[PDB]
Amino acid sequence: ASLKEIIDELGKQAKEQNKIASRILKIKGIKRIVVQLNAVPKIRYSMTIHSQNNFRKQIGITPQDAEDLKLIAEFLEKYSDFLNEYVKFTP
Amino acid sequence: ASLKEIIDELGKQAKEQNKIASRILKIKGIKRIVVQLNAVPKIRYSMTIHSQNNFRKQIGITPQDAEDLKLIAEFLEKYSDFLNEYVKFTP
Ligand SMILES: [Cl-]
Ligand SMILES: [Cl-]
Ligand SMILES: [Cl-]
Ligand SMILES: [Cl-]
Ligand SMILES: [Cl-]
Ligand SMILES: [Cl-]
């Protein structure tokens, strides 16, 4: 499933149901931080990060998360132009 | 104020008061993501990230945050050995 497929799927779901629809992006190489894409409804997107170990609670980062954070930064830069033509983000 | 001064100050506060004590790290160059250090009480540390614009709510990252995330990764790597001898982190 590509990013665009996920974006499209979350958009359609958030509309049919009138509530946030979410999906974990499976960014290659990430060890612990999980990036979740959210479609918030007239549909705007955001991305939140989560620990696999306390998935529902706010993430506490430690120094061992440095490489994850870099991979997330790289993924953002790699898809930046596309995302900025394709979706609107949360305020 | 160095990282160690902040760590020491938050440790002393979290002990005198028996509750989480927190302070924003002023990592040079960050535009929007704020890293806050927390001493949680028998004292363990964590770091949480926050948007300056919705400081109390969970941060929604967008592609413009890529450089902040890299600077946070660099700061973690720069202080990694020190932190791992000097403090214990949250589970
Ligand atoms: Cl992910
Ligand atoms: Cl965590
Ligand atoms: Cl792109
Ligand atoms: Cl900061
Ligand atoms: Cl935000
Ligand atoms: Cl160090």
Swiss-Prot record, chains A, B:
It comes from the Viruses. Transmembrane segments: none annotated. This is Uncharacterized protein 131.
